[PDB]
Amino acid sequence: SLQLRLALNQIDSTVGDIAGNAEAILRWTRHSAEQGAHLVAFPEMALTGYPVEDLALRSSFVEASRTALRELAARLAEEGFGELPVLVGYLDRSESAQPKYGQPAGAPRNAAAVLHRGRVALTFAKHHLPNYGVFDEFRYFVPGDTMPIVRLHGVDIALAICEDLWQDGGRVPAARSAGAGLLLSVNASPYERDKDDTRLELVRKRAQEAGCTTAYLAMIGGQDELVFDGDSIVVDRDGEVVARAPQFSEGCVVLDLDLPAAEAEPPTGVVDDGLRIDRLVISEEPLPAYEAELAGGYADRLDADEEVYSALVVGLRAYVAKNGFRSVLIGLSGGIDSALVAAIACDALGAQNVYGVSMPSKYSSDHSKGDAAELARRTGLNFRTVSIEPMFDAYMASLGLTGLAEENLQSRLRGTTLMAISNQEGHIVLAPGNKSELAVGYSTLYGDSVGAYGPIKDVYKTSIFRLAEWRNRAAAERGQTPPIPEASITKPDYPVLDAILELYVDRDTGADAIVAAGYDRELVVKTLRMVDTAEYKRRQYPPGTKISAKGFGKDRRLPITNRWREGH
Amino acid sequence: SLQLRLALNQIDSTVGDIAGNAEAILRWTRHSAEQGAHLVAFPEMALTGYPVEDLALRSSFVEASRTALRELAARLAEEGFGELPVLVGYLDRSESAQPKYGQPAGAPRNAAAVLHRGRVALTFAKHHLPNYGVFDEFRYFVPGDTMPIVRLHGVDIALAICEDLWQDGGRVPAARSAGAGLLLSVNASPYERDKDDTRLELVRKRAQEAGCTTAYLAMIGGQDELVFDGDSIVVDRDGEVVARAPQFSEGCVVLDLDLPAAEAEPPTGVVDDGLRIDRLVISEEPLPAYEAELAGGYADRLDADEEVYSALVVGLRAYVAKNGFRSVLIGLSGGIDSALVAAIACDALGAQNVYGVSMPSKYSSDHSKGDAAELARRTGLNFRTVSIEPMFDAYMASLGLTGLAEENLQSRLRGTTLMAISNQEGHIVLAPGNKSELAVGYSSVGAYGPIKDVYKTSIFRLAEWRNRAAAERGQTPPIPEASITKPDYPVLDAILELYVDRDTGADAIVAAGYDRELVVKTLRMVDTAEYKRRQYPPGTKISAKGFGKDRRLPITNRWREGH
């Protein structure tokens, strides 16, 4: 059967940096054309970045998106890629009012276009916009009611965007009745820790369902709280893995495929979900046969610890880099949390760009002071110490604080110290709070409530130990110095606590069901109560890397003012 | 045309306080029945509070709602009110899977029920759950598909909940095609500052469309950033106000109506949106016609400044009280914002429960201290003054900050002070920032921000109104005159209102008459202030379209508005 060479470019866009994203697309297309590619693909919304949020509700950004796509198509042909079809995600809008959905004038569409002959040759838009998920595209977006097909070199190529493939009955069976030979799906899929290979089972099912080879191209990188894992795959007609890209790295997959010829009298008009077939004929004629040397390759998988740790690195790196910043500032208590954050920061930015501050009190211990200095020594960290003891006395003199009030003073001092240093020196403060402390609203003591990014805020304490231990082990595996002091590692209880939180916060099981799983009623009700009342504390917590599907995402929330008590 | 006495109870529920809400519904029913009522109605989601947000998704909470409703009904008759139909809003879940909406059994519903004879005699749930609007029941909730009618003393009374009335072809025409005497709508509508009387506009258009007398009973009170403004209306068949409840007050409307009786053979089956008529009959036979005496009464309308001020008060009062607090702590400079916050707090809690603190630095001016001190005396608040200079010098001794950091240090020092005193004494710190400052990103910390959805231009207007209010009843003007009279703000706020509130673009703001360089600079400032307003405390909303969690921008964002 017919052969074709497809290049899939798993790249990293920056939200709003339209011109810079356009430059990268051009740069990666040239790099693709050199490898003999016949089609070049880029992820969902690659021109604008993702998720773009309320910037989708502005005519100026939509128009900037629209104009730049036209200019990129023209720049492609001017560079001599006018015969080369390039599929690019971008943001568009509906011109008409929408009677069929109930959307006004100029509602945005999550779109993708095929760039050919110095022009925009085809334009379709995401069809399925789910109720669930993180992105509220359902509220505001006009869907595409189109089944986009491209005749290229005798092959019908079907196109889709992300959540299209989540729908039972959408563009996947619509591709079948249109007689697709290759399904090309462009994606921006936020990372989600799961022991299942959710990516493979989705594409497997949908490839057999479409009855053709399915290519799934995904964005990589971090945007605010989210991280895109990459992990692009190609999977064949029978569900077997043709090629697979790495998790959490920029990269290209250029490969040769064997694809069925398209029916010379092909179907037209409405298909499965009510989608009209939008044909575009680049080449009706089959391509001259050539040596199919390239298979794409199966990139090495990451283990559970490595995979999470990588997401954390990419998350933190992107927040720093894409906001203009070079450097971070981390308060060092000698504790396990800060040590893991420092380690993540060194991998993200380089040790030169991470600055540590030890902030001791009069009654703060000597292993606290020591382990911070220890951590500094093994990382290459810019370490310093400033005692909060002088400011403590200054406050205590003209206030006279006792008990709970006087303990809270300590942390606000350290917060102020970190904030003041970063104001002078140009750093971003990192908040050290983990998911366990955040859930129950635990007292920070080193000013966790202060900070601009919280790298481990979605990681349970049980997993913090597991990640630190892996990291130290990862260093030793390659002769490098283990970064985290062992005294930091080895100094209701955490494993039971995190287990109950996982049931309640991530799997949304109630008190009755948690006790039935084998946990003690008193401590269950106490823990849940504490989670519920911690609302206001975590509404005001800094952004950080989300690695779970549901959790403390700003998407779901309890009232602050709330007299409901669980387990009455 | 028949008569019955209708008691509408404009009450304030507390979210999650199901026992306490049931306690309050019982006490208000007592007071309704003692005033000889034939029907008692309560607001939307009254048993539960509103909005409950993610509590709606918990089986434990949903079952606690349903059980309390059954326990309330059974308590009604045990208190000897079993003869009296009482309408209550509450949270329910679907018993069966409804494939029409594709929902599984147990999906949440915003419901209301008629309690009679110690039982739950009729149930129905909201039908229209809009894509737009502040709440998002649209996502999780399953619509009730009935058109409920009550036969009480020969009269057909049709029932609806809030957004049902927003729907063109909703339960409104369905009540006309069912032949209803009275349209009883129970509601929980948040406050929006609008010069138009949108409430009257809605209920007039709908009572005409229904072709009958329509009672819109609304919730009153504060919940987080939302304030419910009460203002219940009754409107006749033709569109004239029969009665009108006060704004921002708990109260009751008890009145008598003239209503058409319905047929001995009334309509049945599918109606307008496919709604099945669910009749409940308490009395088929008409009441012994007697001395019609209660008119209802149209309560006094607040003026624009008073309306906004009441909202701010009710919002603050609720956030203190419902959270088990008694007192607040407000930092005091000379400025207008701190003075107005103090003024609002004193009206909300009593001046005894308001604690002010002046926090002067190395070069803190005399009017700062003077006007702070002034405020305390003409108010009755608890004043104190702690210098931040002892702790400013301790920082600069070991840090040595230049211009950038050392100015910011002062703001953080004051925050630490406020939080420490509140930690010691049990006050809630109040954040003094306004909408104009918050949009731009200027400046701090606290639990509540009473004026955070109020522009600076409106801050003066409200301040001057409050002195004018004091003098109109022979009371001492609370806000110092020098505090009031200390991009320029009115052009700034005009641009912010165009951008933030009316969703107008740069080019169009320029077209409206504003200077391109200033517009661009302002809009740039607003876009980059995102991370600041994300970590800002809650506070009273007065406009549905403004800032909030519904509409937001990315923090990582290299888009720049303007060429």
Tab-separated table of N, CA, C and O in Angstrom, chain B residues 115-181:
chain	number	residue	atom	x	y	z
B	115	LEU	N	-44.658	21.048	52.680
B	115	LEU	CA	-44.814	20.239	53.881
B	115	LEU	C	-46.223	20.364	54.463
B	115	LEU	O	-46.720	21.472	54.678
B	116	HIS	N	-46.853	19.216	54.711
B	116	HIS	CA	-48.255	19.139	55.134
B	116	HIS	C	-48.524	17.809	55.837
B	116	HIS	O	-48.073	16.754	55.377
B	117	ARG	N	-49.260	17.877	56.948
B	117	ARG	CA	-49.657	16.704	57.759
B	117	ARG	C	-48.482	15.920	58.365
B	117	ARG	O	-48.596	14.716	58.605
B	118	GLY	N	-47.360	16.593	58.608
B	118	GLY	CA	-46.160	15.924	59.116
B	118	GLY	C	-45.425	15.106	58.066
B	118	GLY	O	-44.708	14.159	58.393
B	119	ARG	N	-45.606	15.485	56.805
B	119	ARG	CA	-45.062	14.757	55.674
B	119	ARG	C	-44.534	15.721	54.630
B	119	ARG	O	-44.825	16.914	54.668
B	120	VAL	N	-43.767	15.186	53.687
B	120	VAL	CA	-43.353	15.932	52.512
B	120	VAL	C	-44.381	15.610	51.436
B	120	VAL	O	-44.328	14.550	50.819
B	121	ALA	N	-45.325	16.522	51.227
B	121	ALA	CA	-46.490	16.247	50.381
B	121	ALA	C	-46.264	16.395	48.869
B	121	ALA	O	-46.962	15.765	48.074
B	122	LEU	N	-45.312	17.237	48.479
B	122	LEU	CA	-44.985	17.463	47.069
B	122	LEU	C	-43.533	17.900	46.964
B	122	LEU	O	-43.042	18.606	47.834
B	123	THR	N	-42.860	17.481	45.897
B	123	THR	CA	-41.503	17.920	45.613
B	123	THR	C	-41.427	18.307	44.149
B	123	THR	O	-42.203	17.809	43.340
B	124	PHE	N	-40.510	19.217	43.828
B	124	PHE	CA	-40.105	19.519	42.457
B	124	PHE	C	-38.734	20.170	42.533
B	124	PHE	O	-38.316	20.605	43.599
B	125	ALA	N	-38.053	20.273	41.402
B	125	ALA	CA	-36.740	20.892	41.384
B	125	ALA	C	-36.639	21.858	40.232
B	125	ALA	O	-37.379	21.726	39.266
B	126	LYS	N	-35.718	22.820	40.342
B	126	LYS	CA	-35.447	23.825	39.307
B	126	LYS	C	-35.317	23.216	37.901
B	126	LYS	O	-34.702	22.169	37.729
B	127	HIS	N	-35.909	23.867	36.905
B	127	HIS	CA	-35.875	23.345	35.544
B	127	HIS	C	-34.798	24.024	34.705
B	127	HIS	O	-34.003	23.352	34.049
B	128	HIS	N	-34.777	25.351	34.725
B	128	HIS	CA	-33.809	26.111	33.947
B	128	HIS	C	-32.524	26.373	34.743
B	128	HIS	O	-32.547	27.064	35.767
B	129	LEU	N	-31.416	25.801	34.270
B	129	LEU	CA	-30.094	26.029	34.856
B	129	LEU	C	-29.197	26.614	33.775
B	129	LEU	O	-28.609	25.867	32.990
B	130	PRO	N	-29.087	27.956	33.731
B	130	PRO	CA	-28.459	28.653	32.608
B	130	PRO	C	-26.945	28.463	32.483
B	130	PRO	O	-26.245	28.248	33.479
B	131	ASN	N	-26.482	28.533	31.238
B	131	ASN	CA	-25.074	28.544	30.867
B	131	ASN	C	-24.356	29.783	31.427
B	131	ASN	O	-23.226	29.693	31.912
B	132	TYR	N	-25.034	30.929	31.352
B	132	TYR	CA	-24.578	32.196	31.936
B	132	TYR	C	-25.093	32.344	33.376
B	132	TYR	O	-25.857	31.501	33.857
B	133	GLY	N	-24.677	33.411	34.056
B	133	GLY	CA	-25.014	33.604	35.470
B	133	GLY	C	-23.899	33.145	36.397
B	133	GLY	O	-22.994	32.412	35.977
B	134	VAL	N	-23.974	33.564	37.660
B	134	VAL	CA	-22.879	33.361	38.629
B	134	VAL	C	-22.704	31.925	39.137
B	134	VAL	O	-21.590	31.518	39.482
B	135	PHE	N	-23.798	31.194	39.204
B	135	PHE	CA	-23.762	29.852	39.727
B	135	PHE	C	-23.608	28.873	38.605
B	135	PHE	O	-23.874	29.201	37.463
B	136	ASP	N	-23.145	27.677	38.917
B	136	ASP	CA	-22.951	26.702	37.877
B	136	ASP	C	-23.573	25.412	38.266
B	136	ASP	O	-22.892	24.440	38.483
B	137	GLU	N	-24.886	25.415	38.334
B	137	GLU	CA	-25.614	24.227	38.656
B	137	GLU	C	-25.780	23.478	37.368
B	137	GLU	O	-26.128	22.318	37.343
B	138	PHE	N	-25.477	24.173	36.291
B	138	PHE	CA	-25.650	23.658	34.960
B	138	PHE	C	-24.796	22.433	34.801
B	138	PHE	O	-25.242	21.421	34.309
B	139	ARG	N	-23.569	22.522	35.277
B	139	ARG	CA	-22.630	21.399	35.258
B	139	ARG	C	-23.130	20.160	35.988
B	139	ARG	O	-23.202	19.082	35.411
B	140	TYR	N	-23.480	20.314	37.257
B	140	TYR	CA	-23.668	19.148	38.111
B	140	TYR	C	-25.114	18.769	38.345
B	140	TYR	O	-25.410	17.610	38.627
B	141	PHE	N	-26.012	19.739	38.216
B	141	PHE	CA	-27.401	19.542	38.617
B	141	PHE	C	-28.291	18.925	37.531
B	141	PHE	O	-28.110	19.183	36.336
B	142	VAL	N	-29.240	18.098	37.962
B	142	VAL	CA	-30.256	17.545	37.064
B	142	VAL	C	-31.615	18.252	37.241
B	142	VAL	O	-32.205	18.213	38.327
B	143	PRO	N	-32.096	18.924	36.174
B	143	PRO	CA	-33.365	19.659	36.155
B	143	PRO	C	-34.584	18.827	36.526
B	143	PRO	O	-34.707	17.679	36.096
B	144	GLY	N	-35.466	19.410	37.337
B	144	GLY	CA	-36.775	18.824	37.623
B	144	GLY	C	-37.708	19.120	36.464
B	144	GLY	O	-37.802	20.263	36.008
B	145	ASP	N	-38.395	18.091	35.981
B	145	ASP	CA	-39.189	18.218	34.758
B	145	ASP	C	-40.706	18.272	34.959
B	145	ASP	O	-41.466	18.088	34.014
B	146	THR	N	-41.137	18.539	36.187
B	146	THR	CA	-42.554	18.714	36.474
B	146	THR	C	-42.979	20.169	36.275
B	146	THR	O	-42.135	21.053	36.093
B	147	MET	N	-44.294	20.392	36.260
B	147	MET	CA	-44.889	21.706	36.486
B	147	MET	C	-45.821	21.538	37.690
B	147	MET	O	-46.973	21.119	37.543
B	148	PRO	N	-45.304	21.826	38.898
B	148	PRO	CA	-46.049	21.578	40.132
B	148	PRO	C	-47.171	22.591	40.383
B	148	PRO	O	-46.977	23.800	40.201
B	149	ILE	N	-48.335	22.085	40.786
B	149	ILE	CA	-49.477	22.918	41.155
B	149	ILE	C	-50.034	22.470	42.507
B	149	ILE	O	-50.086	21.275	42.796
B	150	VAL	N	-50.417	23.437	43.336
B	150	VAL	CA	-51.104	23.153	44.592
B	150	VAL	C	-52.538	23.696	44.569
B	150	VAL	O	-52.762	24.877	44.280
B	151	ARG	N	-53.496	22.806	44.841
B	151	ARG	CA	-54.885	23.169	45.106
B	151	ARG	C	-55.040	23.492	46.586
B	151	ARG	O	-55.134	22.585	47.420
B	152	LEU	N	-55.051	24.780	46.909
B	152	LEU	CA	-55.266	25.226	48.279
B	152	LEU	C	-56.427	26.209	48.308
B	152	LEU	O	-56.356	27.288	47.707
B	153	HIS	N	-57.490	25.809	49.006
B	153	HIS	CA	-58.755	26.548	49.081
B	153	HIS	C	-59.302	26.959	47.699
B	153	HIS	O	-59.510	28.145	47.421
B	154	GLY	N	-59.485	25.966	46.828
B	154	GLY	CA	-60.082	26.165	45.502
B	154	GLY	C	-59.215	26.856	44.463
B	154	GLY	O	-59.624	27.010	43.307
B	155	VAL	N	-58.014	27.261	44.872
B	155	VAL	CA	-57.112	28.043	44.026
B	155	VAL	C	-55.901	27.205	43.602
B	155	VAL	O	-55.308	26.501	44.417
B	156	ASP	N	-55.565	27.275	42.315
B	156	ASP	CA	-54.385	26.608	41.762
B	156	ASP	C	-53.121	27.458	41.901
B	156	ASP	O	-52.975	28.488	41.232
B	157	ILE	N	-52.205	27.015	42.758
B	157	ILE	CA	-50.956	27.739	42.981
B	157	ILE	C	-49.773	27.010	42.324
B	157	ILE	O	-49.424	25.900	42.723
B	158	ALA	N	-49.176	27.645	41.315
B	158	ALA	CA	-48.042	27.080	40.569
B	158	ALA	C	-46.701	27.512	41.159
B	158	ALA	O	-46.572	28.634	41.649
B	159	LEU	N	-45.706	26.628	41.091
B	159	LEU	CA	-44.424	26.842	41.773
B	159	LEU	C	-43.220	26.857	40.830
B	159	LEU	O	-43.158	26.077	39.875
B	160	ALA	N	-42.270	27.752	41.106
B	160	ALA	CA	-41.030	27.859	40.335
B	160	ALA	C	-39.855	28.302	41.216
B	160	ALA	O	-40.059	28.850	42.292
B	161	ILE	N	-38.627	28.053	40.760
B	161	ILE	CA	-37.430	28.468	41.492
B	161	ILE	C	-36.536	29.329	40.610
B	161	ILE	O	-36.098	28.886	39.549
B	162	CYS	N	-36.303	30.561	41.064
B	162	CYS	CA	-35.347	31.529	40.490
B	162	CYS	C	-35.162	31.577	38.965
B	162	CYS	O	-35.924	32.244	38.275
B	163	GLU	N	-34.166	30.864	38.444
B	163	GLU	CA	-33.789	30.965	37.025
B	163	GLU	C	-34.807	30.351	36.055
B	163	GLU	O	-34.701	30.546	34.848
B	164	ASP	N	-35.786	29.619	36.590
B	164	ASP	CA	-36.952	29.164	35.830
B	164	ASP	C	-37.637	30.318	35.110
B	164	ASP	O	-38.038	30.186	33.949
B	165	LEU	N	-37.739	31.450	35.807
B	165	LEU	CA	-38.347	32.670	35.279
B	165	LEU	C	-37.507	33.364	34.205
B	165	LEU	O	-38.023	34.204	33.467
B	166	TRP	N	-36.225	33.022	34.114
B	166	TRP	CA	-35.341	33.615	33.106
B	166	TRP	C	-35.581	32.972	31.746
B	166	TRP	O	-35.292	33.577	30.716
B	167	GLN	N	-36.111	31.747	31.763
B	167	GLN	CA	-36.314	30.937	30.560
B	167	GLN	C	-37.519	31.385	29.745
B	167	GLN	O	-38.644	31.428	30.253
B	168	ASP	N	-37.272	31.704	28.477
B	168	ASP	CA	-38.344	31.963	27.527
B	168	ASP	C	-38.981	30.628	27.142
B	168	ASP	O	-38.346	29.781	26.510
B	169	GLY	N	-40.231	30.442	27.558
B	169	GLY	CA	-40.923	29.168	27.404
B	169	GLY	C	-40.638	28.254	28.580
B	169	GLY	O	-40.561	27.035	28.427
B	170	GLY	N	-40.488	28.849	29.760
B	170	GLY	CA	-40.135	28.106	30.961
B	170	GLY	C	-41.321	27.504	31.677
B	170	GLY	O	-42.235	26.958	31.051
B	171	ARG	N	-41.294	27.597	33.003
B	171	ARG	CA	-42.433	27.221	33.831
B	171	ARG	C	-43.512	28.315	33.893
B	171	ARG	O	-44.626	28.071	34.374
B	172	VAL	N	-43.173	29.507	33.393
B	172	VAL	CA	-44.120	30.626	33.278
B	172	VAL	C	-45.299	30.333	32.319
B	172	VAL	O	-46.439	30.243	32.791
B	173	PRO	N	-45.035	30.135	30.995
B	173	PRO	CA	-46.151	29.800	30.105
B	173	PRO	C	-46.788	28.463	30.454
B	173	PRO	O	-47.972	28.252	30.186
B	174	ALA	N	-45.995	27.583	31.058
B	174	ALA	CA	-46.461	26.295	31.537
B	174	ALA	C	-47.489	26.441	32.652
B	174	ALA	O	-48.326	25.562	32.840
B	175	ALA	N	-47.419	27.545	33.394
B	175	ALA	CA	-48.388	27.807	34.448
B	175	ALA	C	-49.666	28.400	33.858
B	175	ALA	O	-50.759	28.190	34.394
B	176	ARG	N	-49.521	29.138	32.755
B	176	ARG	CA	-50.665	29.687	32.029
B	176	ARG	C	-51.459	28.561	31.382
B	176	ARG	O	-52.685	28.526	31.478
B	177	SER	N	-50.749	27.627	30.753
B	177	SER	CA	-51.386	26.490	30.097
B	177	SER	C	-51.842	25.414	31.090
B	177	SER	O	-52.481	24.436	30.699
B	178	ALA	N	-51.522	25.600	32.370
B	178	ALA	CA	-51.999	24.706	33.425
B	178	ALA	C	-53.182	25.298	34.193
B	178	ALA	O	-53.883	24.582	34.915
B	179	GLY	N	-53.390	26.603	34.030
B	179	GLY	CA	-54.496	27.308	34.669
B	179	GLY	C	-54.244	27.550	36.143
B	179	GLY	O	-54.882	26.935	37.007
B	180	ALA	N	-53.310	28.454	36.427
B	180	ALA	CA	-52.912	28.747	37.796
B	180	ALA	C	-53.446	30.092	38.254
B	180	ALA	O	-53.460	31.058	37.490
B	181	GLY	N	-53.882	30.145	39.507
B	181	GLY	CA	-54.288	31.396	40.128
B	181	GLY	C	-53.074	32.194	40.565
B	181	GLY	O	-52.935	33.365	40.216
